[PDB]
Motif scaffolding. Structure first.
Motif, PDB file in Angstrom:
ATOM      1  N   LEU A 181       0.825  -1.200   0.000  1.00 25.29           N
ATOM      2  CA  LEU A 181       0.000   0.000   0.000  1.00 25.29           C
ATOM      3  C   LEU A 181       0.860   1.251   0.000  1.00 25.29           C
ATOM      4  CD1 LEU A 181      -2.625  -1.167   2.632  1.00 25.29           C
ATOM      5  CD2 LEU A 181      -2.437  -1.744   0.207  1.00 25.29           C
ATOM      6  N   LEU A 185       0.229   4.244  -2.623  1.00 31.51           N
ATOM      7  CA  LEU A 185      -0.047   5.635  -2.291  1.00 31.51           C
ATOM      8  C   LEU A 185       0.997   6.564  -2.888  1.00 31.51           C
ATOM      9  CD1 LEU A 185      -0.655   4.565   1.336  1.00 31.51           C
ATOM     10  CD2 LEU A 185      -2.479   5.552  -0.055  1.00 31.51           C
ATOM     11  N   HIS A 189       0.218   9.628  -5.455  1.00 32.20           N
ATOM     12  CA  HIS A 189       0.612  11.020  -5.288  1.00 32.20           C
ATOM     13  C   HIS A 189       1.359  11.511  -6.518  1.00 32.20           C
ATOM     14  CE1 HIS A 189       2.191  14.713  -3.681  1.00 32.20           C
ATOM     15  NE2 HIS A 189       1.623  14.505  -2.508  1.00 32.20           N
ATOM     16  N   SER A 228     -10.925   7.558  -4.965  1.00 31.67           N
ATOM     17  CA  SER A 228      -9.506   7.293  -4.771  1.00 31.67           C
ATOM     18  C   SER A 228      -9.246   7.022  -3.294  1.00 31.67           C
ATOM     19  CB  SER A 228      -8.654   8.464  -5.266  1.00 31.67           C
ATOM     20  OG  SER A 228      -8.882   9.618  -4.478  1.00 31.67           O
ATOM     21  N   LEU A 230      -8.700   7.516  -0.196  1.00 30.31           N
ATOM     22  CA  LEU A 230      -8.799   8.398   0.961  1.00 30.31           C
ATOM     23  C   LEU A 230     -10.082   8.120   1.730  1.00 30.31           C
ATOM     24  CD1 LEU A 230      -7.449  11.689  -0.608  1.00 30.31           C
ATOM     25  CD2 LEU A 230      -6.243  10.170   0.954  1.00 30.31           C
ATOM     26  N   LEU A 232     -10.838   6.649   4.877  1.00 29.89           N
ATOM     27  CA  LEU A 232     -10.934   6.971   6.301  1.00 29.89           C
ATOM     28  C   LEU A 232     -10.242   8.307   6.540  1.00 29.89           C
ATOM     29  CD1 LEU A 232     -10.307   3.388   7.695  1.00 29.89           C
ATOM     30  CD2 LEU A 232     -12.434   4.453   6.969  1.00 29.89           C
ATOM     31  N   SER A 233     -11.018   9.382   6.431  1.00 32.57           N
ATOM     32  CA  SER A 233     -10.499  10.713   6.147  1.00 32.57           C
ATOM     33  C   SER A 233      -9.960  11.449   7.367  1.00 32.57           C
ATOM     34  CB  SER A 233     -11.587  11.568   5.498  1.00 32.57           C
ATOM     35  OG  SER A 233     -12.540  11.988   6.455  1.00 32.57           O
ATOM     36  N   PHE A 235      -7.455  12.260   8.720  1.00 34.08           N
ATOM     37  CA  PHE A 235      -6.026  12.551   8.642  1.00 34.08           C
ATOM     38  C   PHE A 235      -5.730  13.849   9.373  1.00 34.08           C
ATOM     39  CE2 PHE A 235      -4.420   9.390   5.686  1.00 34.08           C
ATOM     40  CZ  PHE A 235      -5.600   8.870   5.196  1.00 34.08           C
TER      41      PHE A 235
END
Lengths: 244, 231, 132, 51
Positions: A181, A185, A189, A228, A230, A232-233, A235
């Motif tokens: 993962l 990621l 990006h 896309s 993201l 479980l936001s 952050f």
């Protein structure tokens, strides 16, 4: 909006009638349950597909050994290319190729290393070229850091939250699979910037690399329901401690 | 005599000190990392082998509190680095001077304030980076891009185009079944934070403090996604 | 184990299932507790009670049988919640367990118009002594 | 439990009648009392794991 839904029933010819009332709070909860299970399954499936597709490519040896070596020039390139194509298809399922010109550079020295964005591009000095820090990628795979799962969560209320407590050859470690993962990621990006500059000029690309901030405008009319990674936001970190 | 208390729970002392050191240098994983008694136990546990006493000496140097960087007793420094690798019992995973210096700065802040409640705060900065000159990102942009353009690809990897795939759907399902039991949700966040730490792990060099707000923008990527959903 | 309740139901984990604490059951079985020789409270006997003054193999003993009542009443209390959630929401199975308390309301119009096992009307202690 | 009983008795220099049911105990192998809700999480989980 507590909505004690209210209901009545009648005999024909209106002899007499009965009343009842009910509460959505069970139904919405079950809806949420189904939603999260659904999307979780989707994500798991996607990851599985990615992993298998990579598995096809006849690697002699487990992944990490690759980057632990540095003599390679094929495998690493192949990996990167594969990931990029996967992302591009995830956004354009009908699209299959980029019309050549894609070329890569291994970077080995701190004196070539660049902070933050670990994968970098020159879209056309005649043609596209890319650059990658294998040393850093090993550092990102400083795997020792990993450990058994914590189970924290916040904003609990009651079993209103907890109700799921009553709502019903590479045969190789989950954690090592999980490491993938990371590169997923990372390349995601990178693909952001690649797409941006591929659509527009160099100077705005430089501006985005200066601040991954102004993106939020141009990355619009761009995600036509193409979700896309993201989910479980939450952050976030301690903020007030920034103390200027 | 009673030799018990000095090492009786060697297990505690070793495991906790090593856990702590991994927390600092290896940044390993979230924990309620603290015990000042363990901090003392670090020293006492060091005081029973020379392959400790060397590191103990270095660490004691921090009690002078000045930010000076000690002279490299090259040979002895190297033997000491090897002893560090050994006493960290890692798969020779490239333990390095830079991480050693990072630990030095860690203790350069650890004892340095008697904050007897909770400095529950990242101290990202290090004084002991190669300079306090603290030049900015922008110049290094040029400095890097120069040699970047100067370099020639190690391989000229592309001609034409292809796509890879496979369709052993039964195989994929077998995999899926193998894959099921793992709490993805938790398992991934630690790696995400590893990516986060990676930024600092890069700039040990004239570092540029700011990261936070652009990270917040990375997080508001999801915000923008929601906004797109809603138009 | 769990506080308070020695029994619990998972209403439909695909199907109903139940879990029970044998340890705690035995702890209730620690009947060295028991002794009969006691004395009932009374009041106002001349009016109230003096009137009442003037009226009158397996052959197992009683104490054990008395103990039966324990599990009887326990399973009653459990059945209450079981019925409730079997008829109603897991929200009101969060509730009823966060406290029992309020479920009197749902029992309203719900009870079978027949009493159960709650004769002797006092069941209480000192209360104001909660001394918070 | 009995130890704590005795560690509650002499505590009284008190000879007047005492209405004091010290139901509480200190020695519950922890710094301080948690809620029950966490246990409602924690037991329930393993219970669902059990078969």
């Amino acid at each position: 909006k507590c909505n004690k839904v209210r209901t009545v029933t009648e005999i024909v010819n209106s002899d007499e009638k009965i009343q009842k009332t009910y509460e959505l709070a069970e139904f919405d909860l079950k809806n949420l349950s189904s939603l999260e299970s659904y999307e979780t399954l989707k994500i798991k499936l996607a990851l599985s597909k990615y992993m298998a597709m990579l598995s096809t490519l006849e690697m002699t040896q487990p992944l990490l050994e690759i980057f632990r070596n540095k003599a390679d020039t094929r495998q690493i390139a192949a990996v990167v290319f594969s990931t990029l194509a996967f992302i591009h298809n995830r956004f354009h399922p009908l699209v299959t190729n980029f019309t050549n010109k894609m070329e890569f550079v291994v970077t080995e020295t701190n004196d070539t290393s660049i902070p933050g964005e670990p994968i970098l591009f020159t879209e056309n000095e005649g043609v596209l070229l890319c650059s990658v820090d294998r040393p850093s990628i090993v550092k990102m795979l400083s795997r020792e850091f990993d450990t058994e799962a914590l189970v924290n969560f916040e904003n609990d209320n009651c079993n209103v939250r907890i109700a799921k407590t009553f709502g019903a050859d590479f045969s190789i470690t989950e954690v090592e699979a999980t490491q993938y993962l990371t590169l997923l990621l990372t390349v995601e990006h990178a693909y952001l910037h690649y797409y941006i500059f591929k659509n527009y000029g160099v100077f705005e690309y430089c501006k985005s690399l200066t601040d991954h901030s102004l993106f939020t405008n141009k990355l619009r009319s761009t995600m036509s329901t193409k979700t896309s990674n993201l989910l479980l936001s939450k952050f976030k970190f301690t903020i007030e401690d920034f103390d200027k | 005599a009673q030799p018990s208390e000095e090492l009786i729970n060697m297990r505690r002392y070793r495991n906790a000190a090593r856990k702590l050191i991994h927390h600092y240098s290896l940044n390993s994983t979230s924990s309620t990392e603290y015990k000042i008694s363990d901090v003392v136990m670090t020293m006492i546990f060091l005081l029973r082998s020379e392959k400790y006493h060397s590191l103990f000496k270095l660490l004691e140097t921090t009690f002078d509190d000045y930010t000076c960087r000690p002279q490299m007793t090259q040979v002895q420094t190297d033997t000491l680095l090897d002893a560090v690798r050994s006493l960290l019992e890692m798969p020779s995973t490239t333990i390095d001077l830079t991480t050693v210096d990072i630990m030095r700065s860690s203790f350069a802040r650890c004892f340095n304030s008697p904050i007897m409640r909770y400095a529950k705060i990242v101290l990202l900065q290090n004084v002991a980076l190669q300079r306090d000159k603290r030049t900015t990102l922008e110049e290094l942009l040029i400095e890097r891009g120069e040699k970047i353009q100067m370099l020639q690809p190690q391989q000229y990897i592309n001609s034409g185009t292809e796509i890879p795939f496979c369709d052993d759907a039964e195989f994929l399902n077998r995999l899926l079944k193998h894959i099921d039991p793992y709490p993805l949700s938790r398992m991934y966040y630690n790696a995400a934070n590893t990516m986060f730490y990676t930024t600092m792990e890069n700039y040990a060099v004239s570092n540029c403090k700011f990261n936070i707000e652009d990270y917040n923008n990375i997080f508001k990527v999801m915000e923008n996604i929601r906004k797109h959903s809603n138009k």
